């Protein structure tokens, strides 16, 4: 596997290079159907770019075709959510779904049951902002989600997950964080992935109900 032979800087540059673009919503009444359609249309175009980016996540090509399908179908909503949360960091109290679709908690009440997941997304974005989450840290967490969300439902994936951990610590040590600050920040970031998993599971219930 070529992923395990990369240095930390090469792993960072490879992940930053594979970042998908920020798409726009259609922008064409005010309805829950009009709003769910705009988000459905937007997420469907993000998925296509999301299927290109994991292909460039180191260690993902090494998996079999059936395993790649398994990881993506487990983590796709998580990856969409952490990307949205990341885009919204510098817009407190608002979720930037697109540069032309910036919504606050109040506008989320237009859809039934979304205001709860809306508040959880806002709280996750505020937490990233107070930690000063860096882009290099963000692309590492998003790769972790992809390789970890479906891994227990395998040594190669776990050895890649270890290298991504080495990369996060490498970034923190380079920024001047003490050893204690390194393992605390690492723990803080990875614990957020549990809430992102929680938000994904709540989101899947409404999608299976909307269908």
């Amino acid at each position: 596997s070529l992923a395990l032979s990369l240095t930390a800087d090469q792993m960072v540059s490879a992940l930053l290079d594979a970042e998908p673009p920020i798409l726009y919503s259609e922008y064409d009444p005010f309805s829950e159907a009009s709003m769910m359609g705009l988000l459905t249309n937007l997420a469907d175009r993000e998925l296509v770019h999301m299927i290109n980016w994991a292909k460039r996540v180191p260690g993902f090509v090494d998996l079999t075709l059936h395993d790649q399908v398994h990881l993506l179908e487990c983590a796709w909503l998580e990856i969409l959510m952490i990307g949205l949360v990341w885009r919204s960091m510098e817009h407190p109290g608002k979720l930037l779904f697109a540069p032309n679709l910036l919504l606050d908690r109040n506008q989320g009440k237009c859809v039934e049951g979304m205001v709860e997941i809306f508040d959880m997304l806002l709280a996750t974005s505020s937490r990233f902002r107070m930690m000063n989450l860096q882009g290099e840290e963000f692309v590492c967490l998003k790769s972790i989600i992809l390789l970890n969300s479906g891994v227990y439902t395998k040594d190669h994936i776990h050895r890649v997950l270890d290298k991504i951990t080495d990369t996060l610590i490498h970034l923190m040590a380079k920024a001047g964080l003490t050893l204690q600050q390194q393992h605390q920040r690492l723990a803080q970031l990875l614990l957020i992935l549990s809430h992102i998993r929680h938000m994904s599971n709540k989101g899947m219930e409404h999608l299976y109900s909307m269908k």
Binding site: V48, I51, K55, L65, Q68, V69, L72, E73
Partner: peptide, 7 residues
């Protein structure tokens, strides 16, 4: 569908 995008 997901296989074709990966292939």
């Amino acid at each position: 569908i997901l296989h074709r995008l990966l292939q």
